[PDB]
Design a protein around this ligand. Structure first.
Ligand SMILES: N[C@H](CC1CCCCC1)C(=O)N1CCC[C@H]1C(=O)NCc1cccc(Cl)c1
Ligand code: NA
Ligand code: NA
Lengths: 9, 27, 249
């Protein structure tokens, strides 16, 4: 349900 | 140094909607 | 948070979300106490009855957030953990005594309008503020009853220790306090699942700064009449916090 975070991190 | 002073509230002398509930309880 | 309200933007700029890397999800609340240290509940990290034992690489810290699920580009910041420190006498076996952990960030976080550390109490602030009837504020993205779009906030009164003790079969220690309304009080509200590790803060009327007096720790159910939420007593574990930072800072 979470928007994906940038690949980095 | 600056801990606990919020940029969008204390630093601008603006109060949030319910902090006065807290102050009023400090009796 | 049960029976709370949506936070205002920037209302709790010390709020941190503990975020699991796979699968991507909210683990816990936490708080920022300097540009490289985050405070949370030990049980967020280590809780063998539930097979919970995280290491640095399992998690991220998201700071500056408002929305629970959205990636808040240009506002939130996402940080990696260098090291976790859990209280050496944390009692996960019986009553979650000394329910406290520190997390050291790999790099310092930049402060901003939405990102700013909370103060930790000295002994005289603790003595003055930690009194039955005095209200604090708890914040989190946890369950709305036994999920929110944005950060929730609720103000709750500290409860007298005999009442706290009589509300439960758990052995309560000096390293905890309880907060919440009585059934006869009208008002209600509580922390809940997901809010663990988040801060209970109070605004000092002496110097008008916010202090973190508690960490969201445990409750039998959420917002039950006659029951109270239990919070780690930050001032009582201050020595340990100072020790960790002063040694590993
Ligand atoms: N229902 C349990 C009761 C605890 C009581 C101490 C001994 C371990 C079991 C509990 O609260 N737990 C078990 C593991 C973590 C914690 C929790 O859910 N805390 C979140 C929470 C929920 C409601 C109110 C608060 Cl203050 C905190
Ligand atoms: Na003053
Ligand atoms: Na209750």
């Amino acid at each position: 349900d979470f928007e994906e975070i940038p690949e980095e991190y | 140094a600056d801990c606990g002073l919020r940029p969008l509230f204390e630093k601008k002398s603006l109060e949030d909607k319910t902090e006065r509930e807290l102050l009023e309880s400090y009796i | 948070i049960v029976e709370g309200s949506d936070a205002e933007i920037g209302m709790s700029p010390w709020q941190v979300m503990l975020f699991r890397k796979s699968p991507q999800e909210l683990l816990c609340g936490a708080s920022l106490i300097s540009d490289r240290w985050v405070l949370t509940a030990a049980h967020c990290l280590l809780y063998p009855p539930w097979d919970k034992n995280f290491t640095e690489n399992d998690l991220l810290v998201r700071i500056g957030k408002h929305s629970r699920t959205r990636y808040e580009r240009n506002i939130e910041k996402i940080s990696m953990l260098e090291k976790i420190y859990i209280h050496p006498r944390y009692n996960w076996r019986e009553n979650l005594d000394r329910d406290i952990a520190l997390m050291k960030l790999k790099k310092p976080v930049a402060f901003s309008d939405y990102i700013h550390p909370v103060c930790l109490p000295d002994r005289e602030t603790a003595a003055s503020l930690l009194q039955a009837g005095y209200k604090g504020r708890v914040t989190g993205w946890g369950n709305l009853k036994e999920q929110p779009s944005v950060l929730q906030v609720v103000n709750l009164p500290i409860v007298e220790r005999p009442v706290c003790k009589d509300s439960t079969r758990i052995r309560i220690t000096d390293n905890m306090f309880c907060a919440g309304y009585k059934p006869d009080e009208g008002k209600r509200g509580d922390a809940c699942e997901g809010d663990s590790g988040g801060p209970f803060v109070m605004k000092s009327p002496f110097n008008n700064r916010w202090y973190q007096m508690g960490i969201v720790s445990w409750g039998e159910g959420c917002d039950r009449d006659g029951k109270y939420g239990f919070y780690t007593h930050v001032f009582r574990l201050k020595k340990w916090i100072q020790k960790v930072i002063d040694q590993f800072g």
